[model samples]
Target: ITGVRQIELWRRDDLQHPRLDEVAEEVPVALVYNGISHVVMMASPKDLEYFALGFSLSEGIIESPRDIFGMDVVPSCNGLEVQIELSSRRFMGLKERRIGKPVQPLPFTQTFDLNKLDDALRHLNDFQPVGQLTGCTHAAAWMLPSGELVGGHEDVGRHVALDKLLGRRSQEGESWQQGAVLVSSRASYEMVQKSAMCGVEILFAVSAATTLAVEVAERCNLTLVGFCKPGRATVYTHPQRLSN
Candidate 1:
């Protein structure tokens, strides 16, 4: 209801039958930090708070949740607007970081059991309520190496889904190093960078991995898995992390 809209559509088989179909609602969510508009993202209407925090963290705008003093979600004329107030220190740091060089490669040594990965993949769909209803939304999930799913979030934009998941994880005070991220989409450069920036050691995607994603994952020593279907998966980088 919040993220889905019912619309009239036609089902064609032998005859055209009018029916109602559910579609995911994609709206522009503007992230305004300290009264300055940074960027606008087309995302699902749900989880704006989490999305804001996750985007802030992944983008290196703030080092920790404490850096965020407060936040508010307001319905705007164009779409939704997230007003985030950052700590003065982090706010100043953001200015310098914006002019800084590229992100440094992270060192990761954690390993995951291959069997546990398969189990997580099999159960990943259980977390995607929006995707199940609309079949158009993507999902991101956080899981432990023991095959336990921590949480999941869904959005029309794949990156927004990941931001929501990461944001919620941060709110729960979970350590990203102890878990892997599973996404229901292809692994892109931005996805890999965001995971690595948040100290995620492993990332799994249900589809393929882009060349830049593989490069970034390898550089950051992150285990990148793609084409994660039932009974099969492809490890694109850092295979040592996946042990039998």
Candidate 2:
């Protein structure tokens, strides 16, 4: 509800039917660390805290949750600002860690059951409240190998949705090595890179995969699945992780 707005629109089936429709809201969210503006993302207004923490961790801005001293969400006329107080050591280290550089690959030893993916797909839409209402938001979910969902988040941006889910998961001290990530969007290079940075072994997407996404997944030893639907999906890299 916080991330959705109602507007009047006409639906053209046979005739124009005017009705009130729910639309997803996207706005600029700036993540500031130690009073310094780091980066701004266009995302759903909800879940700013999770988005902040997730982006911080995924982008290697901070090594651990302990690296963050405090966080606050302040609303401004322009958008929202997530002000984060980070540890002095990690904050200084940020200069050395440039974004878009290849992330160090993490070892993925555990395998996943193919059927677990089906279970995850079947339940993907259940966690997408905003997407269900507006049909414009994207969602990301983290699921254990047992088919139990850890959590999920919906946002106007797919990457932000993932950061929300992963951020909350990180706060809960969950291990990314033990579960898979499911996204209701295409698998882009950034998506794969973020997953790999968090040591997520498998990433499943409901849409097509980019070539760069495939290449990065291959290099990172991450299982990348795309065009994932109810019955069929394409496994692009590291298929060994998915057992029949």
Candidate 3:
């Protein structure tokens, strides 16, 4: 938090391969829902409103914006906290669902095929200018099952970018359970929780999968695929759903 507000410039090779560079202050932000701490993700402050709405939607904490009571950003001397309030019924539903209770869909389901999924992931990967532009940053995307992209955010942290995508989609009224997701990050157990919490059915990543991710996918009956290139992607769990 100290470095956040402080402005200290570091000069290095600006471009990759030993060029001059400039360092600036990166913003700090926290996310709180109904007084429960979810996660702290650093993001561009300009999109905090969208970020708050999106996080709510993807996390399955709220079905729609209508269910949201109030949203505000609490600015602290150290960092910022995004606070969100939801309808009591929706808030209580979260607890019920957590305890092995059944909950219905938050939005209409969108059907997508492998071809569409591949195309979107390819597009997302292709749009990474930062990696090529500076040899840094991670790109992540959320795709509807029909293969359409819902969110594509880039950051130095794969988890940060993914957090942004999940948060953004929720704000846009796109329910995660109604679709699938794609990431530029390596698949891991945490990735599984991130996708599953949003109710995403399938997770596709450019890298390999972790053992725990596969286990989570298998146990939850969610479809998962990894090592996705432009035309091909390898699936790990719940392959039957993709057959249709």
Candidate 4:
């Protein structure tokens, strides 16, 4: 009920028969901050608060979780709602920066061991329980400096999956500076931005990094590794951070 649900269907074979299947549930979730609608996204119906906090930070709605002085979830006719309140200055900053582009990712000081990075990527797919059953969700995992997987989350959207990962970190007050993040999706530009924003020094993706993503990583001084396979990986930026 929390992560997945079953639905009724019909299977057409040599003869039509009643069938039931389990599928990932997708719902519209609205993010409201300071009594204003910020964005609506289709997401799986768990970890809503994590999604909200992570999304608020990623979208620049609030600079930090502390900026969000209050948060609550209320039922809506069609779906779920996350209501958030920001500090006065933070709210003013949001208004002033309305329609403004996100600040460039700041440089981070950290490094990772290549072998550990490889091990984490090798087992990343094993952690996605929802995706294993529903086959419609994506996953993101936080990798420790030693290449160990600390936490992860699954969502219908790639970015949302990473947001959930970041949200979990935010909730725990974990320092992402000494850690890397691994995702089941491609290394898009925003993906790099989100990691860099969190002070994550390394990002390992199961797929390729975009040209723009590589550029951002270079400037942000974050390590970007793409095409992560069992024994090897392609380093796009800050290769110096990884052991040779």
Candidate 5:
């Protein structure tokens, strides 16, 4: 990260009893893909290798770090820029998945109920040990209807976190539609399409969903749920399966 600056902020000093102001340094980061600048975010400059690998995976640009030809963090006047190169094969695969219907995903025959699904969701939340304690990050998981959690991952970015889970398990050649994806972010169209790309049947989010996301889920016959909190959830599509 570049353009680093330190600032003092109020904090509760446990030893001091009440509270206190502490000085901290903040670093700005910018992510660049194929020299095309995407979005910039403020994050702690650490574990960045995982961060870059995670970015390529979740952005639907590449499946693994193998897809990334090169990556580097460059210091800039305003912030840090993450420059990344991608493989032609993975890039072509991404194009096919988006425009040409890449390879087909696997399917599942398992079935589950609300309680089991709730437990699966709980399993996802438990993966973020740091995020949970720090209250600064989120997690996502992919699981089967039988409550068989394929995997879960955590990241500062909810979407990237989702990618971390999906990208890793995607290799075993499993079908996403036969199961569900539980995310800590809002159910937006991007996630909807992300799920659809993998042929996922159900998409659950801890936050709200957009109208477009619901429409896409409905059109694909995919179940969508949001605002999934303890003792409550809102089903946008396939409400029938959610009952009991």
Candidate 6:
């Protein structure tokens, strides 16, 4: 997909002489559900289908691929618009799913040792090969408690990145409890919910976690760690999951 676009720029030095440079492109992407605008985000205009499905699933708008009947990308003069057509039943189900049900508080005993956490921090930056190149994509990865990096997905939207990762994990029938999710973005409320919904117990973010995220993690019994790195991390919930 065209996640990165080539654009020309002018650079100047000590003198007035200018040099032409190539840069990555960013565009405003509007997400529409049945003719209603939901979120207008800045993203690369590639992978619209995945972005749509991932956002819907992460946000609890649609539970399954079957729930969404059709999706289309229409190019407009301002930017691209993703139009999603949903099934009637699932469309109505989104109401109760929003801000209504708490995540099941399941018993979890998995822990990430110091070494495993360190390696996860180091490798977290390495997993996003696309972001390294384009400098615009966000990535989400799952690391086994033993420190093995298994799967990762990248997207222009941070939420979509994690949703794509979760979608693939579900497709592969992988056990989410045995591993930790490493993301290249902040831990938002919906991000935490998506992880907890899929049985992923530990969520580590390279950036900060919002206050609401910590609250949700606490209720869901999900372990939320933000600013995760080699030096230190701020653990929000389930400190027992961190081993020295």
Best by lDDT: 1
lDDT tens digits, residue span 1-244, model 1: 6888899887776347778889889999999989988899999998999999999888888889899888999999889999999989877877666523256776656778777777788777887777888999889998887778878999998999999998988887845448789899999989988888787888989999888889988888888999988778899998877887
Off by over 4 Å in 4: 10-15, 99-102, 174-176
Give the runs in model 1 whose Cα sits over 4 Å from its true position.
13-17, 96-101, 175-177
RMSD of 4: 2.1
Sort every candidate by TM-score, greatest first.
Answer: 1, 2, 4, 6, 3, 5
Ranking by lDDT: 1, 2, 4, 6, 3, 5
* Tens digits of per-residue lDDT for model 5, 1-244: 2212233344454544444332222356676767766667655444444556655654556654567778787888875788877687865565456333332332433244666666776677576655654555677777777766776766666665665566555644545436677888888876776665655667779889898988877766667889987666788886655546
TM-score for candidate 2: 0.93
Cα deviation at 152, candidate 2, in Å, is 0.2
lDDT at 170 for candidate 4?
Answer: 83
The residue-level lDDT of candidate 4 at 178 comes to: 67
lDDT of 2: 0.85
**After superposition, which runs of candidate 3 have C-alpha atoms over 4 Å from their true positions?**
1-18, 22-26, 33-39, 44-46, 54-67, 86-112, 125-132, 174-179
Task: Give the winner by TM-score: 1 or 4.
Answer: 1
Model 5 accuracy (lDDT, Cα): 0.64
State the lDDT at 134 in candidate 2: 83
Model 3 score (lDDT) = 0.65
* lDDT of each residue in 124-210, candidate 3, tens digit only: 855354443444556677676667776576655666567667767665663544667778778887666666666666778888988
What digit string (tens of lDDT, one per residue) describes model 6 on residues 1-244? 3565555455554346554433444677787877877788776666567667766766667666678777899988778898888888866665445434446774686688756777777776675555776677788888888878787777777877787777666555645438788898989998999888767888889889888999999998999999977887888999888787
In angstroms, the error of model 4 at 218 is 2.0
